[PDB]
Amino acid sequence: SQDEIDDLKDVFELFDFWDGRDGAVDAFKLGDVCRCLGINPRNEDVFAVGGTHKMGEKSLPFEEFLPAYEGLMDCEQGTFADYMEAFKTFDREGQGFISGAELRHVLTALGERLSDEDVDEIIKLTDLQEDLEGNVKYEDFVKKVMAGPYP
Amino acid sequence: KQIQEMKEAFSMIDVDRDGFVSKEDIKAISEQLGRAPDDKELTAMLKEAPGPLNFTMFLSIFSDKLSGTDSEETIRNAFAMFDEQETKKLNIEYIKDLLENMGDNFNKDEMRMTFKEAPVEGGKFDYVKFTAMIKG
Amino acid sequence: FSDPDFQYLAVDQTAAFDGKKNCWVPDEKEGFASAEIQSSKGDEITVKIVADSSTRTVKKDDIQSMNPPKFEKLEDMANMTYLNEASVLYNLRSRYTSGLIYTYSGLFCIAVNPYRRLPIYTDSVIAKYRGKRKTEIPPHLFSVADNAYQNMVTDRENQSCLITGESGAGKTENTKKVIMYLAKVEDQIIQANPVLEAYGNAKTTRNNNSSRFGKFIRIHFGPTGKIAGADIETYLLEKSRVTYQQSAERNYHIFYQICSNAIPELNDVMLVTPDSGLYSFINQGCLTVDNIDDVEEFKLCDEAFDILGFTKEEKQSMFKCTASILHMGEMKFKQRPREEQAESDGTAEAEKVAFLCGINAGDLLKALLKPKVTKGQNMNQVVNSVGALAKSLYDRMFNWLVRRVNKTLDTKAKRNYYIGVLDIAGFEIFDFNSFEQLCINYTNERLQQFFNHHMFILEQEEYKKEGIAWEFIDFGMDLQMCIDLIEKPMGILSILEEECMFPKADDKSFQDKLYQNHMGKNRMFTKPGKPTRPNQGPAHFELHHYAGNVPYSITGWLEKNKDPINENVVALLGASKEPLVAEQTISAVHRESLNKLMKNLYSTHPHFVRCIIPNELKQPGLVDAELVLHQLQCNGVLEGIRICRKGFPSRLIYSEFKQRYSILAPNAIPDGKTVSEKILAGLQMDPAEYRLGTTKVFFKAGVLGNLEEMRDERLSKIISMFQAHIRGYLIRKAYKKLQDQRIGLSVIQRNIRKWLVLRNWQWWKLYSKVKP
């Protein structure tokens, strides 16, 4: 819709400006752009539409940008069910727990990995805390991440 | 307490204990410690004060220097603004990168002058300790 | 184990065997020949016959993989590497020529007729088979019986054995040994066979003791697992043998017993002269029977009536009514050139008849020559109603006889479950085939298809039910057709049935009305071909039955299906002196009996016995490979074994299945057994690669490995999606800062440049210096 495309516009600027204002954005940021308009595509997802592994590789106008966002819209988003399901498969106890160490492993080691920094990051952000045994309720965590930075 | 020092200072600097600072006053004490400035340095160093250097025109030029700056809290935050995880440290390559080619790009010298002091140990540059050092 | 009791029961094997040289090549005499390849040439393989050492070529795709000496005389064929018509025929024939006549074919048993008595049924042997698990002891029919018992007991459900095979195979002998077995682990039961066989068996070319009725006998069990009763059901007795018997065949056994002098005392009670070749109704075909002593069989039959608990009058009522028949056919006649109605040609024999049936000889011949509103009969209309009467009496005797023997067995004791045994009469093709045969054959079909259903159609269904994993397999084994050609709405029988109700009808409107409906509209129905056996009497059409092509002559099929006895004589006998005598079409009726039988069967855990006729000569220990092989084909043995080896080894309890495979269609999950019904449904999973189950799912082979594939995939994605979610959260979190960081950087950039320039201020330098 218009108020929508206007939103793409709004954000496109903040970005195209920061990597040198000139009406073009580094295809390596196309991810973060859309990540700002709510959506959270997967790296596999982004490259599919035009994203790049590195800066410099290439820049893009707003003309080519419209469809990348048309694209990253029709792509699957994870529900609470799904995040709850997957996390259960690591719980031997079955009581909604996990250890810090393991959670760390899941994030950094499995699936489209996550740097060790983004991890200590979101941990601190969501202010996730372990008990005496060093375990955490993965249910709470999933809920925050899902919540947003500003709830 | 910034004043208490200023005075006691002006005292040690004002050698001929005449309540005034003269080209000989400066030259005097400098040499008693480390290398001192050349006549030209001493000259324009005084010309920086309209009239005689009583403990007043002293505190005047010193205060007009340290004026036009912010807080130790205001700066410690402009820093934690890149410290997502809230660890109270910035990764050295990061900060260096920010200052170097972002915003109002620094220069190699600004870069060297700055890090010659900087408290970096373990890859992480502690912006707290450094905010203090640069401030109070 | 050194046990003498295993002489003809336990298998008594190395070198010269190249798994690439040695193979099975088609043969005309032996069905398959042991060959050793010599040279390939595209498709033309050149092998050497190990036997005669001759040579020949054979299409490459006609060679069959031979099994290694590792499986010589194997007890269970499902355990062989190769289960092909040549490996099977070889294994059997191997065992057979060594005394071993029992072999498992996977889940069911194979019995090859011995044509000789074997010391394998003794009480010594029965002791050893008791409570033994099929793999624990050599193959034997006792094992099949013993196991059905254990199942009924532990599983708490009815069991059942369908003993099938061709005519002269071993269906009856084996049915009896099963009962004799179950009885031994009672006296009257065993004793009901001698009387029923005397009245419902006869020499035939094929069988000297051919059963001419279908037999289903259920054996009830009580709360301590012991025999507590039993009943018998019979089907379609050959009413026709009574008055007629093709050459080389005899009438029922009794008639010959009755004229031997086993009990001279009875001669005057029946009014018979001890000469069978004296009575037309029983000397048409054969008289004597190699290996059947009518003298002793009569005695034992008499002896058996006693044990059954038959009052002396009762058992003399039987004997007389049947000897009476021996007279109905002695009543000669004549016409009287004019009108012909017909007149008698004496009365001596027609009285003995009225006498034995306790009715007036006068009132008889009367209601027989001018049935009453009156309506006289000609000279043949009579001789044929005579036969109509003989046949109809005998059909009542036999029926009453069974009701009575059940009287003696339906002990009102307490019943839990039972074990039935089905012995139905088998396939038979003669020189001339008519309605009688179509009936037997339609019967036998039928059954085969049951095995096909429960064996292939069935197996996979349960896999689905339980909700396991699997992919379908078409064994291509269906006769619904043949079945359909005969039984369905417009079928053969239905045509005949609607043709009887018309008095106008005849052997030609029936014959034409048939082609009219199925010629070219059903390929099982084919114009009569060409002779495959001398003396091959007339044929009007052919049917392609599971075990053979049968040329049927439909002449006389209209009267054969609509019975017809002077409703007059039925009045005479209705009020006869003898107490016994005093006491819907055939097609429809039988079709119904049969359907009811089948219905009763389906509610069972079937164990199958497969009989096999070794040759067409009735001689023992001799094999005719072609014939054998041929049976190992129309019976479905091989296939019957593939699934036992092939099958669906997976198995999952819906409770543990839902927990592990919900994550594969969660947008369809609002009960563990339905949830899975959904998941596997969502995935648009092939009904083949899996099966139902009450408490568990059955997935064909490999499938579960593949589900754990899809399972991971999803688990990886989801993990990525939550990492994506974490990537998007952190980005959006730092969005204010793109303004915030632009400021927070200008602070630091402008405020370091200050502290930088302040240190480059002489005053400050010198100041800092003084400091201490």
Numbering used by the authors:
A (entry chain Z): 4 to 154
B (entry chain Y): 15 to 150
C (entry chain C): 5 to 16, 24 to 196, 216 to 402, 410 to 620, 643 to 729, 734 to 835
Quote the original article:
In the step-release experiment (rls-HST), the fiber was released by 0.75% in 2.5 ms and the freezing impact occurred 6.5 ms later. Although a step release decreased the total number of weak attachments, it did not change the relative proportion of pre-stroke versus TM-bridges (71% : 29%). The range of structural variation in weak-binding attachments can be appreciated by superimposing the quasiatomic models onto a common origin. With the MDs superimposed onto that of the scallop transition state structure, the image can be interpreted as inherent flexibility of the myosin head. In contrast, more of the weak-binding bridges in rls-HST are pre-stroke bridges (gray) and therefore their lever arm angles appear anticlockwise with respect to the scallop structure. Weak-binding myosin heads within the target zone sweep out a smaller axial range, 27° (5 nm) for str-HST and 9° (2 nm) for rls-HST, than the strong-binding heads. The azimuthal mode for weak-binding bridges in iso- and rls-HST is 120° and represents attachments that did not need their lever arms azimuthally rotated away from the starting crystal structure in order to fit within the EM density. For a 6–9 nm release, the detachment rate also increases to 104 s−1, but the conversion from weak to strong binding is even faster, >105 s−1 (k45), indicating that most of the pre-stroke attachments would convert to strong binding ones. Releasing the muscle moves the target zone toward the end of the shortening cycle thereby “consuming” the available TM-bridges by presenting them with a favorably placed target zone to which they can bind strongly.
